[PDB]
Amino acid sequence: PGECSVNVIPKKNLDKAKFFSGTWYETHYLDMDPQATEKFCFSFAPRESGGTVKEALYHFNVDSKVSFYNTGTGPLESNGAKYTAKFNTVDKKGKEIKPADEKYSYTVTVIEAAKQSALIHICLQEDGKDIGDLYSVLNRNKNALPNKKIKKALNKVSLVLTKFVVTKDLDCKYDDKFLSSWQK
Ligand code: HEM
């Protein structure tokens, strides 16, 4: 199965204005498929208004030296820390170059946030069925280590940080202006 993890708990009372602002950098990630070993850098700029999330996504494939740009949009759950989005493909100037494929979606759960750190989980789906998932440690600073509360949250779901890929050890290239200028 490409079954998504159980026991993924949304943070209680996430500060929305703080989390859904600025740019987040992935510092550590754990793809739950052990054979998924392509190296990636990830950053994004999530925004929220009227119960709808609109986020700009940036990935960089370290192996192939190719970047790609996406935007995602979807309703925020009443718990305020989980959303399911559909995504399109845009160029670096933000113009759509491929429309959203209706059969795909992803569900982001914000498990924990503390200081400059966060822990999220993403369940990818096709036609509403699980096709894979990943845990991501985020920071406002690319080079920073996570707050201990992020580790505490990992421990509750029987994960340890040492299992994660460390992003700062990769030769990343970022488009920071794409994210900085999001919804400007
Ligand atoms: C460090 C964290 C992450 C890593 C390492 C990662 C890795 C990947 C990989 C391996 C792919 C497949 C690319 C390909 O098929 O060539 C991908 C695609 C994608 N991911 Fe991520 N991901 C991360 C976090 C996220 C997050 C947090 C989101 C949403 C908020 C997200 C949304 C997407 C989307 C929309 C695609 C496009 C799939 C496609 O075009 O077929 N990812 N990512």
- What domains can you pick out in the chain, each with its CATH number? 1-184 (2.40.128.20)
Alpha carbon of 85 to ligand 1 centroid (Å): 13
Structure solved via: X-ray
The pick from 37, 134, 135, 163 for probing ligand 1's pocket by mutation, whose C-beta has the most ligand atoms within 8 angstroms, reads 134
Name the nearest CA neighbour of 163 among 32, 3, 14, 25.
Answer: 32
Q: Strand, helix or coil at 46?
A: strand
Name the nearest CA neighbour of 47 among 16, 15, 5, 89.
Answer: 16
Question: Which residue's alpha carbon is nearest to atom 18 within ligand 1?
Answer: 59
- Residue 34 has φ and ψ, to the nearest 5°, of -65, -15
Residue 59 in marked binding region? yes
Count of C-beta atoms within a 10 Å radius of residue 48? 17
DSSP code of 61?
E
- Using alpha carbons only, what angle is made at residue 57 by residues 120 and 85, rounded to the nearest 5 degrees? 65
Q: Which long-range contacts (CB under 8 A, 24 or more apart) does 63-69 make?
A: 63/38, 63/39, 65/173, 67/92, 67/173, 67/175, 69/94, 69/175, 69/178
